[PDB]
From Swiss-Prot, chains A, B:
Gene3D superfamilies: Chitobiase/beta-hexosaminidase domain 2-like, Glycosidases. This is Beta-hexosaminidase subunit beta. The record marks 424 as: Not glycosylated. It holds the Pfam family Glycohydro_20b2. The active site is at residue 282.
């Protein structure tokens, strides 16, 4: 049995137990607060049965507190569980449905076949819970359109890896595949074609599918930069340049914040998750500055020719729109770095590789929750075993007091879409993102390279077996 | 119509012609030297018909010289053809079957559908032939075992790209998947498992399949280094180390050259191609030197403690074995660089990235035919549009007289198997190898980056359409 990520506490015995496919149930212990009526658990029981294939007859699942079956996971969902692997009835015990889903994955990783076909598990006890609560994968469905199928498999692979946030970078300069109901033109004119679109029903599917796995779907609607496609269905939203044609959203018109309010109100209803990622990265001033109506606004606010001041103005106003619909904001570092005024609990995401520990220190010294992604740019491929580099990151090596560190809520592996699509996305992501997943779940001090190597190669074969085309770590084979 | 690689001469007119799927034949002109009895051409006609889907009724194919239907391509096979695209009957005219196969690919790339579905081709004339005759892809089926299927698709993708040599690096340190009939133990004990093997019938298939496409299958049986797996089924073949256990083949025993003669005689019958690649790269001396029976041989030949002298001894003896069965040798630069005596027409393959133009000059100054692969290590992946780097290579920028340059016979894109297998091989290879293919086929002076970009993105969609999962070049979509 290969475990990935490696649970917080594992105690095994040398007593072997066996399982009979046509004769082994997973079900609710009579004391569980969840029962048959509970889809999320029901579907899990069935799909894991499949994954899995001196007696163990059964795995009882006991949800201790109110199960939250019908809810969406959020930031502080309880993921803890325990596993007592014993004859004749094994037990998975969790506070909440979210714990149970994690535990089921761990249990599956413990069943295995000996040289003769026999399904075997060791007597053991497992105590487990995540080291960090925000465990993301970022996907880019604008640079390339990812079909819904491929998004779902990703969700499956994320489950197998205990990741819990799908950071959906849904739109960008190149294409606007999100179909909006109050704004039909955005996608009609900005999508790559009528069949590179996510309908409200595609969005619905992805969301449910992720929920059923304890995954949160965090939408990113990046502004004011990276918004070239928004302009095709929105008259007057983008700044016109005086010489490129268009630059960032024009932050000086009422019509602009008008639209943005309507829009984000729709978003706030479509995506159940607490947070909206607002982007705010990489905004070009060269354009705003060549433009005379902006010139004029700069004069009227006395902003000089510091265009950060204007980036601030805009972003802050959007921040307020988000606050007004009672949602949280996430924001790329640039927003913080350019000193906009942020509400308490705004999450800042540190993505710039340049001395990010000092970034982490600054953000946390300001008292904001912080998410790391900088050393985890997976689109940034290179030769050989780079998973090691990702795995060896210690997110908490920065200067900062205890309370400061408590503000670090986790991180994301990023796969940006410039060079990625259906043809290459999976082998590119996996197992490389696994290294990231284990570091974000297991202990601080889980770091033997040889052992990591060993479980990872075996985990990867498992993934392949479950139809994730994850790529090799090094020379070898499966079975 | 996107062309790749771009034929030597293309003359188009603005007259459009149309094609009717259920009504368009490719067949033999009555004067062709090939007719129905000719499988290679028959199968081509059918498979291209499929690829393809004011009138063009037909494409007549005229083979001018003896067709060579039943032969294997070799180094100097005639690949030239012409294409007269006219109503009502178009004409493909080639000296040989090999030309015809190229031409058919070009014709397919010229048919296309307008906005209304209509199959269209422009009136045009095409004159085409390759700038270099050796156009390889190297695959590694030892670091990972590639199933026969995936080898075949590669062969298909190579055809679509006019590549004509599959450099089969079949065995290496990690695994010996080649099943040998005079040596059953080699694969029984050296393969990854009984089901990671190439049977004589797998080899037969691959060979025919490539032949049917004008592809030569060049086997590499690398020695004396990279031979760790040979040892599991061959007692006494590998040097034992005195402290790793085993090092390179022990070049001092008779039993060694005994085996190697039997073996290469089997190879010489199994693989139809003229050349055998002998490897000869990266041989470690640290082992031979720790060993006392080698020590003793060194003394008896008065080789001092220059172990190149012994690498020479061995390799030369193998060279003679090859010569004795009337086959050609190919050899990695190290063999030349360590000054072994080579027969006239031994091909040296330059693979080391360190100032290879001066390597090219030295080899060609010695009068040997030379093959470049150094700037074309495709396993050496990196971020972004690296196809450009590959495409911009000018193989002939080295110092050397005309006659010297005439010795440069071509090159290979290499995909070594340390990090590669079925899960990632195709998107890794394609379209990156396309850049290599065009540079090895088209003119010296075909090099507009924008145009290359444009045809390549379109070529790549074609490949995807024909079920090659080739990866993107940059942001965008197909159709
Ligand atoms: C899960 O259960 C399996 C099966 O009990 C455990 O594997 C077994 O481990 C013992 C060591 O505790 C092996 O015994 C050994 O015998 C040889 C002499 O032949 C010697 O090298 C050692 O000193 C040792 O006594 C036993 O072979 C081994 N494997 C099997 C298949 O029975 C396994 O350790 C348990 N896993 C965990 C993580 O607890
Ligand atoms: C293959 O045949 C097609 C169809 O004839 C050729 O495309 C056509 O090219 C002409 C230019 O020769 C286009 O005419 C243009 O008209 C506009 C005014 O509306 C003006 O911008 C130009 O000065 C020019 O006169 C025509 O639209 C165009 N396309 C089609 C679909 O008919 C094509 O060039 C041929 N390809 C090659 C490589 O020869
Ligand atoms: C937040 C940065 C960012 N934002 C957007 N909208 N797109 C991107 N492609 C990136 C990016 C930055 C660095 C690398 Cl190496 C790769 C991608
Ligand atoms: C001829 C060199 C060679 N021979 C063998 N048998 N295996 C290899 N993997 C390589 C190799 C060398 C450099 C790179 Cl970058 C990648 C692979
Ligand atoms: C934004 C939102 O709906 N947050 C809820 C919160 O009330 C609850 O206590 C938490 C932990 O279970 O999960 C979620
Ligand atoms: C090694 C071998 O069989 N070479 C043959 C050669 O006789 C022939 O002339 C050449 C060109 O058509 O093709 C091949
Ligand atoms: C623009 O903004 C102000 C205050 O924010 C608003 O009330 C006003 O009517 C708007 N003006 C125009 C000209 O659209
Ligand atoms: C080894 O080599 C020689 C000559 O090449 C051969 O004739 C001889 O009999 C061999 N000796 C042994 C001891 O195997």
């Amino acid at each position: 049995p290969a475990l990935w990520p490696l649970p917080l506490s594992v105690k095994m015995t040398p007593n072997l137990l066996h399982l009979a496919p046509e004769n082994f149930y997973i079900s609710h212990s009579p004391n569980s607060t969840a029962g048959p009526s509970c889809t999320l658990l029901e579907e899990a029981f069935r799909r894991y049965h499949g994954y899995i294939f001196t007696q163990v007859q059964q795995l009882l699942v006991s949800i201790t507190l109110q199960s939250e079956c019908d809810a969406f996971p959020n930031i502080s969902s309880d993921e803890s569980y325990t596993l007592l692997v014993k004859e004749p009835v094994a037990v998975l015990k969790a506070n909440r449905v979210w714990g149970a889903l994690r535990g089921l994955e761990t249990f599956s990783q413990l069943v295995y076949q000996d040289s003769y076909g026999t399904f075997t598990i060791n007597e053991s006890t497992i105590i487990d819970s995540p080291r960090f609560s925000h465990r993301g994968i970022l996907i880019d469905t604008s640079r390339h359109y990812l079909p819904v199928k491929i998004i779902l498999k990703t969700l499956d692979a994320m489950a197998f890896n205990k990741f819990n946030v799908l950071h959906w970078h849904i739109v960008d300069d190149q294409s606007f595949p999100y179909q909006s109901i109050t704004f039909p033109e955005l996608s009609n004119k900005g999508s790559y074609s009528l069949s590179h679109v996510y309908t409200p029903n595609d969005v619905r599917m992805v969301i449910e599918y992720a929920r059923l796995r304890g995954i949160r779907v965090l939408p990113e609607f990046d502004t004011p930069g990276h918004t070239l496609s928004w302009g095709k269905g929105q008259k007057d939203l983008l700044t016109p340049c005086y010489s490129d044609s268009f630059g960032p959203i024009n932050p000086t018109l009422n019509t602009t914040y008008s639209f943005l309010t309507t829009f984000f109100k729709e978003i706030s209803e479509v995506f159940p998750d607490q947070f909206i990622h607002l982007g705010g990265d990489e905004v070009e001033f060269k354009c705003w500055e060549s433009n005379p109506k902006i010139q004029d606004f700069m004069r009227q606010k006395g902003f000089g020719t510091d265009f950060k001041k204007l980036e601030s103005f805009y972003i802050q106003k959007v921040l307020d729109i988000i606050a007004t619909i009672n949602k949280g904001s996430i924001v790329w570092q640039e927003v913080f770095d350019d000193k906009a005024k942020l509400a308490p609990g705004t999450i800042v995401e540190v993505w710039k590789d340049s001395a990010y520990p000092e970034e982490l220190s600054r953000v946390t010294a300001s008292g904001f929750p912080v998410i790391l992604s900088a050393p985890w740019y997976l689109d940034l491929i290179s030769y050989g075993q780079d998973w090691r580099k990702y795995y060896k990151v210690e997110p908490l090596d920065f200067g900062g007091t205890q309370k400061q560190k408590q503000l670090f809520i986790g991180g994301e592996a990023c796969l940006w879409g410039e060079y990625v699509d259906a043809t290459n996305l999976t082998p590119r992501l996996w197992p490389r993102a696994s290294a990231v997943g284990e570091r974000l779940w297991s202990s601080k001090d889980v770091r033997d390279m040889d052992d990591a190597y060993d479980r990872l190669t075996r985990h990867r074969c498992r993934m392949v077996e479950r139809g994730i085309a994850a790529q090799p770590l090094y020379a070898g084979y499966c079975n």
